[PDB]
């Protein structure tokens, strides 16, 4: 199945205390592999999955340096933004950056990303063609015009189309053991009588990887949406994931409903039926 | 591996 690599960066001003808090993480699909935290002791990019630990000293020195420069750029960015939005030095503000790339099952390039938020709203993003920009509003138009003149996209594109995917390739290869495993979900169904007249049927999907999953309800073999709760996929905390789906059903009708699970780890999708 | 060049806004 397909794969990605994404870095996420976050800075948060804190006028009165020191410099902005800067937090950066890198992921390959759903596995975080590097982190940097301006507030931590070591002042270094640190490993977070066994397979990146293989990289030699020059990697760590280099990545530390590059992540530092990201942070220092965000530092300037906070200010320039404060300015464009005539905001006072008093308030705390947040910049957020994310970029990276997707490849298909053949590891050939598929899509590139680069985007930028100010105080929790878009600000500027590189369109899907990696050749033009979307400015979220009028202030961002100043950036877009700057970055157009500066041929910024051209550089971004070469990275995303090339360097990004080559490194993703390397990572996947080196991380074969873990990253291209697929963990089928362990599935079961629970039943709780909500009253004399109703009962909840909850369909569980535990310990799976990747995080991409679909749980759907059916009644008499037709897609069932009404009276359905479905929660956000959540990390188990040991590298795998959980989700659940529930329907409330009239008591005595439990046999009509079936739960359907699809996940790349499963040769054919599962159907579960309350199993009295 | 991180981008080396980050353009300011």
């Amino acid at each position, epitope marked *: 199945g397909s794969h990605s690599m994404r870095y996420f960066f976050t800075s948060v001003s804190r006028p009165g205390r020191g410099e902005p808090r800067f937090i950066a993480v890198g992921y390959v699909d759903d596995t975080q592999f590097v982190r940097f935290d301006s507030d931590a002791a070591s002042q270094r990019m640190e490993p977070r999955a066994p397979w990146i630990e293989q990289e030699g000293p*020059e*990697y760590w*020195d*280099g990545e530390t*340096r*590059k992540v530092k*420069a990201h942070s*220092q*750029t965000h*530092r*300037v960015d906070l*200010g320039t933004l404060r300015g464009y939005y005539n905001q006072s030095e008093a308030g705390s503000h947040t910049v957020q950056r994310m970029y990276g790339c997707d490849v298909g099952s053949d590891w050939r390039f598929l899509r590139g990303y680069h985007q930028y938020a100010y105080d929790g709203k878009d600000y500027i993003a590189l369109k899907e063609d990696l050749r033009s920009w979307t400015a979220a509003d009028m202030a961002a138009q100043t950036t877009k015009h700057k970055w157009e003149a*500066a*041929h*910024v996209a*051209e*550089q971004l594109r*070469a*990275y995303l189309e090339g*360097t*990004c995917v080559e*490194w993703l390739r390397r990572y996947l290869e080196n991380g074969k053991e873990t990253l291209q495993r697929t963990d089928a979900p362990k599935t079961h169904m629970t039943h709780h009588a909500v009253s004399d007249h109703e009962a909840t049927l909850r369909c569980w999907a535990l310990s799976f990887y990747p995080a991409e999953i679909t749980l759907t309800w059916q009644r008499d073999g037709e897609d069932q949406t009404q009276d359905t709760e479905l929660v956000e996929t959540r990390p188990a905390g040991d590298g795998t994931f959980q989700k659940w789906a529930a329907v409330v059903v009239p008591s005595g009708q439990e046999q009509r409903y079936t739960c359907h699970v699809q996940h790349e780890g499963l040769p054919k999708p599962l159907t579960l039926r309350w199993e009295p | *591996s*991180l*981008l*080396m*060049w*980050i*353009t*300011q806004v």
Partner: antibody, heavy 119, light 110 residues
Framework: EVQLLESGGGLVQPGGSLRLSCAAS????????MGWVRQAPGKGLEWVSS????????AYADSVKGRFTISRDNSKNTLYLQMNSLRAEDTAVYYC????????????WGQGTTVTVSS | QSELTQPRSVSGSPGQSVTISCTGT?????????VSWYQQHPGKAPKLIIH???IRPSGVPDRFSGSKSGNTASLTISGLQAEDEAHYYC?????????FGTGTDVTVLG
């Protein structure tokens, strides 16, 4: 016995192409950001373009935006600079140079090569 | 793009100190701690003498030092010597490009 050795540069007409090569030896080439810095006679150091590592690279000076293209082939320890639509402005010694790590600056230089753009 | 900015030329006597300012904006030299200085002797390639504002590469002599304070970076040479007469260039990261300074001319008086 570090050595960057510039080639592929002579005289070229205005609007011409030229493509410079830089054979590199005695340092681990794939650890180094690679770059070009040029120096017109009488005048000061410029900075044309740089490529990184690893991830990172490429970037170009505003005076060469989209005329120039940097590239690297480690399986060959060689660095490339495609130079098209050359104006007289571009007349200089071009130096091949490395950085030991990101943002370090150029700590390994070539001897330089000469590019004259003229009719 | 643009600039850096150093005095056209600074001079001094043997044994003396000399300083070469190099000034930019909050956006390059004021933006980051990545300034480096180079030395270039007549018809010879540049050589790196400072990096990361303050560090000297293993190799270079003890009487060279870098510093920076706001948007100006400085290079002090102390105990000046004949073979120090040369051109010096600062140079800084600026996020999306590198930019050399306009270069200075160090002389040794008398």
């Amino acid at each position: 016995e570090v050595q960057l050795l510039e080639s592929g540069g002579g005289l070229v007409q205005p609007g011409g192409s030229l493509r410079l090569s830089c054979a590199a030896s005695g340092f681990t080439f794939s650890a180094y950001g690679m770059g070009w810095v040029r120096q017109a006679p009488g005048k000061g150091l410029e900075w044309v373009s740089s490529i990184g590592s690893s991830g990172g690279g490429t970037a170009y000076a505003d005076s060469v935006k989209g005329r120039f293209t940097i590239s690297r082939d480690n399986s060959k320890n060689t660095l490339y600079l495609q130079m098209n639509s050359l104006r007289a402005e571009d007349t200089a010694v071009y130096y091949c140079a490395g950085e030991l790590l990101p943002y370090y600056g150029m700590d390994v230089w070539g001897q330089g090569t000469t590019v004259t753009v003229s009719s | 793009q643009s600039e850096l900015t150093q005095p056209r030329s600074v001079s001094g006597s043997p044994g003396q100190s000399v300083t070469i300012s190099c000034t930019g904006t909050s956006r390059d030299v004021g933006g980051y701690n990545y300034v480096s200085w180079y030395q270039q002797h007549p018809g010879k390639a540049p050589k790196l003498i400072i990096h990361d504002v303050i560090i000297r590469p293993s190799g270079v002599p003890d009487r060279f030092s870098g510093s920076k304070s706001g948007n100006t970076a400085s290079l002090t040479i102390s105990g000046l010597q004949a073979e120090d007469e040369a051109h010096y260039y600062c140079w800084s990261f600026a996020g999306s490009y590198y930019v050399f300074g306009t270069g200075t001319d160090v002389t040794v008086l008398g």
